[PDB]
Design an enzyme around this catalytic site. Structure first.
Site, mmCIF file in Angstrom:
data_model
loop_
_atom_site.group_PDB
_atom_site.id
_atom_site.type_symbol
_atom_site.label_atom_id
_atom_site.label_comp_id
_atom_site.label_asym_id
_atom_site.label_seq_id
_atom_site.Cartn_x
_atom_site.Cartn_y
_atom_site.Cartn_z
ATOM 1 N N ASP A 123 3.277 1.282 2.935
ATOM 2 C CA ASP A 123 3.117 0.666 4.353
ATOM 3 C C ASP A 123 3.700 1.714 5.285
ATOM 4 O O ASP A 123 4.366 1.476 6.312
ATOM 5 C CB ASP A 123 4.204 -0.229 4.217
ATOM 6 C CG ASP A 123 3.903 -1.445 5.379
ATOM 7 O OD1 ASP A 123 2.887 -1.426 5.977
ATOM 8 O OD2 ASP A 123 4.885 -2.082 5.807
ATOM 9 N N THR B 40 -1.565 -1.748 6.168
ATOM 10 C CA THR B 40 -1.696 -1.835 7.383
ATOM 11 C C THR B 40 -3.398 -1.401 7.713
ATOM 12 O O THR B 40 -3.602 -0.456 7.448
ATOM 13 C CB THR B 40 -0.725 -1.351 8.565
ATOM 14 O OG1 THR B 40 0.398 -1.784 8.565
ATOM 15 C CG2 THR B 40 -1.346 -1.386 10.094
ATOM 16 N N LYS C 30 3.545 3.823 8.652
ATOM 17 C CA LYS C 30 3.136 3.738 9.935
ATOM 18 C C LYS C 30 4.261 3.982 10.723
ATOM 19 O O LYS C 30 5.383 3.790 10.399
ATOM 20 C CB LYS C 30 2.603 2.233 10.036
ATOM 21 C CG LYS C 30 3.464 1.202 9.919
ATOM 22 C CD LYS C 30 2.752 0.029 10.018
ATOM 23 C CE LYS C 30 3.619 -1.383 9.509
ATOM 24 N NZ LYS C 30 3.095 -2.465 10.129
ATOM 25 N N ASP D 231 11.494 -0.696 5.591
ATOM 26 C CA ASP D 231 10.345 -1.673 5.132
ATOM 27 C C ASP D 231 9.752 -1.345 3.643
ATOM 28 O O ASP D 231 8.765 -0.756 3.627
ATOM 29 C CB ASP D 231 9.518 -2.071 5.920
ATOM 30 C CG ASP D 231 8.721 -3.412 5.562
ATOM 31 O OD1 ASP D 231 8.635 -3.866 4.433
ATOM 32 O OD2 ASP D 231 8.184 -4.111 6.250
ATOM 33 N N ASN E 263 7.554 1.820 10.959
ATOM 34 C CA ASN E 263 8.421 1.586 9.755
ATOM 35 C C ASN E 263 9.510 3.040 9.668
ATOM 36 O O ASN E 263 10.095 3.289 8.824
ATOM 37 C CB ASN E 263 7.660 1.686 8.701
ATOM 38 C CG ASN E 263 7.313 0.007 8.337
ATOM 39 O OD1 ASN E 263 7.792 -0.811 9.330
ATOM 40 N ND2 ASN E 263 6.480 0.008 7.580
#
Ligand SMILES: N=C(N)NCCC[C@@H](NC(=O)[C@@H](CCCNC(=N)N)NC(=O)CCCCCNC(=O)[C@H]1O[C@@H](n2cnc3c(N)ncnc32)[C@H](O)[C@@H]1O)C(N)=O
Ligand SMILES: N=C(N)NCCC[C@@H](NC(=O)[C@@H](CCCNC(=N)N)NC(=O)CCCCCNC(=O)[C@H]1O[C@@H](n2cnc3c(N)ncnc32)[C@H](O)[C@@H]1O)C(N)=O
EC number: 2.7.11.11
Length: 341
Positions: free
Chosen positions: A157, A192, A159, A175, A162
């Site tokens: 995840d 994502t 990005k 996260d 985060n």
């Protein structure tokens, strides 16, 4: 010797992780011990709030997850992975899970509060990060993945949202709701859209190499200010990723472009991080030649952006969200699902 020292560090890290993985931590706290301050982030099955621990006066970020929405959205296993991984890991650029517990409605994960806000806000506010600035952040994610991948953990995840900036201007990754222990392949379609490797999109079983692709996306987005495959609808984002046709801003250095060409590689036999020399193909790349890997790890390097803070529990670095009430039902919900939490 710097070579033996990496392997001995990694051996020990594995030992520590595996002990904590086999003998965990559970029922560390209760909701009544915390005063709710402010919403720091919203999501589809949960939210994250600034809370204060009343005994100590210390502030924490408390992730609150609605048990019924978790089940519906098919995130039970993922939610259990998150708590289990977060209690077991220990690395300078990973958020620290301090307490976890549940009640009748919710799952609680109480993290150390990182007051500098998301990298996302900082990046949108200033346009783009100049190359040395992007490189400082990218070095931290590179060490972070080397650590997680050595433990057979895939993050999945990455990005700006985060990546939280601490008081020293260093990153903490938050996260772990898509993080997974996997020695070989895995098959869940998650991540994502802008950050998905072509192999996830194409419903192929995949490995930790999706993390290194996402590192490419992050680095391009830090240095450009927008990600390399963008569209208004996810469907057209996917089409773009899968051809892998990427254009670079004219201001990107040749070294940056060469690096990003090797991360944003559709071909797995060619993507850096996935070759025989592992993570060293990235650490020894020319774009990183001025990077002192040890000094980054030790946080000796002066951060190019230090956040403003007015003491404990300042939220000036976070955007504002509608405050909703935390409801706790009289009847236990989803008990068997979450008996392991
Ligand atoms: N407006 C909305 N309602 N939707 C926005 C969605 C935001 C977000 N969450 C979710 O929808 C779903 C997951 C499905 C989406 N797929 C992906 N994971 N990519 N998650 C959920 O519903 C879980 C609740 C929110 C957790 C994530 N946010 C966060 O984790 C944010 O909370 C702050 N935060 C987190 N930890 C900390 C900390 N230790 N210190 C300070 N702030 C923190 C920080 O601002 C982070 O960006 C997402 N898309 O990832
Ligand atoms: N030197 C630094 N360290 N920073 C200073 C750089 C400032 C410089 N801009 C840029 O380098 C960058 C910064 C990109 C991120 N933008 C924002 N966050 N608002 N901008 C550029 O180089 C020009 C944009 C080319 C992208 C294609 N998009 C587009 O054609 C349209 O979408 C919007 N847009 C593009 N990216 C974004 C984004 N990430 N966020 C919001 N809007 C965007 C934009 O308003 C366009 O009308 C500039 N002079 O505008």
């Amino acid at each position: 010797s710097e070579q033996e020292s990496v392997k001995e560090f990694l051996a020990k890290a594995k030992e520590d992780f595996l002990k904590k993985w086999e003998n965990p931590a559970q029922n560390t706290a209760h909701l009544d011990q915390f005063e709710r301050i402010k919403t720091l982030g919203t999501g589809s099955f949960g939210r994250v709030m600034l809370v204060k621990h009343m005994e100590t006066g210390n502030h924490y970020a408390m992730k609150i997850l609605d048990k019924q929405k978790v089940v519906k959205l098919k995130q039970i296993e993922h939610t259990l992975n998150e708590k289990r991984i977060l209690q077991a890991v220990n690395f300078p650029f990973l958020v620290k899970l301090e307490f976890s517990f549940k009640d009748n409605s919710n799952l609680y994960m109480v993290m150390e509060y990182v007051p500098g806000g998301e990298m996302f806000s900082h990046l949108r506010r200033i346009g783009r990060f100049s190359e040395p600035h992007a490189r400082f952040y990218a070095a931290q994610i590179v060490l972070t993945f080397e650590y997680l991948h050595s433990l057979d953990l895939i993050y999945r995840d990455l990005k700006p949202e985060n990546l939280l900036i601490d008081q020293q201007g260093y990153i903490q990754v938050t996260d772990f709701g898509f993080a997974k222990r996997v020695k070989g392949r895995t098959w869940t379609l998650c991540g994502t859209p802008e950050y998905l490797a072509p192999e996830i999109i194409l419903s192929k079983g995949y490995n930790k190499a999706v993390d290194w692709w996402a590192l490419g996306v992050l680095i391009y987005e830090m240095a450009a200010g927008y990600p390399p495959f963008f569209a208004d609808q996810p469907i057209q984002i996917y089409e773009k990723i899968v051809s892998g046709k990427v254009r670079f801003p004219s201001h990107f250095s040749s070294d940056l472009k060469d690096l990003l060409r090797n991360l944003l590689q559709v071909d797995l036999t060619k993507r850096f991080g996935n070759l025989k020399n592992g993570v060293n193909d990235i650490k020894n790349h020319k774009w990183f030649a001025t990077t002192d890997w040890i000094a980054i790890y030790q946080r000796k390097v002066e951060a190019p952006f230090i956040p403003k803070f007015k003491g404990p529990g300042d939220t000036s670095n976070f955007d504002d969200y509608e405050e909703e009430e935390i409801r706790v039902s009289i009847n236990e919900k989803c008990g068997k699902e979450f008996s392991e939490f």
